[PDB]
Design a protein around this ligand. Structure first.
Ligand SMILES: C=CC[Si](CC=C)(c1ccc(OC[C@@H](O)CCC(=O)O)c(C)c1)c1ccc(OCC(O)(CC)CC)c(C)c1
Lengths: 240, 11
């Protein structure tokens, strides 16, 4: 059964999400304007979008129970390697399967696969990304499970460069046992059938999506003209 | 060190 500490963890994560995710999308007015038609016209606007959510992801991570017990180096390693994946996860909230688009409140801020293309990325990434968004939406996660999966994603002990992998695993285990126990006691069948295994699979899907984005980002960011439209935070987290 | 804006956002 769900221990008092486990429902505390869920409460903390639910609150952290509501403080770091804004469903009004009111800050999108501050980004560079979206340009939709050859040129990578969506790169300025999407760079600002990504940079904004990296900030939100950092804010969420800082509130995960136990995260701040890690060294600053480990917190950096965990966030640099996971931010792209948490963005993919948290973007599923705005994703809609009616037209396979990320609807963030307005047509200007409604993104489809054409907009991903107009940021330099190819179907090598977009195709498995949409399949991921579809499959994640299929799980119909409770918000409790949604925030738990984002937090498990962040505190992963196998990320490259992690120093105190013992502590990272112990933190992730408390989150993992919290999620498993939550599914048993609060997710009724048949929705809970193999749910934990399917959620862990999505973490594996994310590692592959991470790999492909990182390789396309490295190719895109190698061109200095493209690097110019990125933000300093994006360049710091995703790489030079 | 090398991630000053990440470190600053981590307080
Ligand atoms: C057009 C496609 C939409 Si996107 C699909 C998802 C993966 C997407 C959609 C919604 C989002 O909203 C998230 C909430 O967090 C905001 C609410 C809040 O937090 O308040 C976010 C953040 C992203 C995407 C596009 C581009 C891109 O990178 C391009 C790049 O590689 C160019 C070199 C890096 C700059 C990435 C990484 C993702």
């Amino acid at each position: 059964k769900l221990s008092e500490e486990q429902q505390h963890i869920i409460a903390i994560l639910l609150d952290a999400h509501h403080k770091t995710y804004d469903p009004t999308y009111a800050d999108f007015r501050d980004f560079r304007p979206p340009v939709r038609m050859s040129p990578l016209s969506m790169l300025p606007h999407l760079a600002d979008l990504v940079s904004y959510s990296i900030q939100k992801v950092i804010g969420f991570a800082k509130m995960i129970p136990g995260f701040r017990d890690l060294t600053s180096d480990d917190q950096i390693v965990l966030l640099k390697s996971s931010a792209i994946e948490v963005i993919m996860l948290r973007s599923n909230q705005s994703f809609t399967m009616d037209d396979m688009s990320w609807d963030c409140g307005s047509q200007d801020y409604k993104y489809d696969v054409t907009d991903v293309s107009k940021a330099g990325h190819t179907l090598e990434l977009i195709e498995p990304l949409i399949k991921f968004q579809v499959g994640l939406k299929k799980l119909n996660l409770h918000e409790e499970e949604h925030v738990l999966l984002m937090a498990i994603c962040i505190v992963s002990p196998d990320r490259p460069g992690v120093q105190d992998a013992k502590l990272v695993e112990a933190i992730q285990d408390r989150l993992s046992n919290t999620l498993q126990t939550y599914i048993r006691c609060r997710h009724p069948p048949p929705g809970s059938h193999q749910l934990y295994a399917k959620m862990i699979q999505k973490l594996a899907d994310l590692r592959s999506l991470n790999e492909e984005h990182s390789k396309q980002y490295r190719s895109l960011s190698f061109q200095p003209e493209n690097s110019m439209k990125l933000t300093p935070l994006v360049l710091e987290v995703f790489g030079n | 060190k090398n991630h000053p804006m990440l470190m600053n956002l981590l307080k």
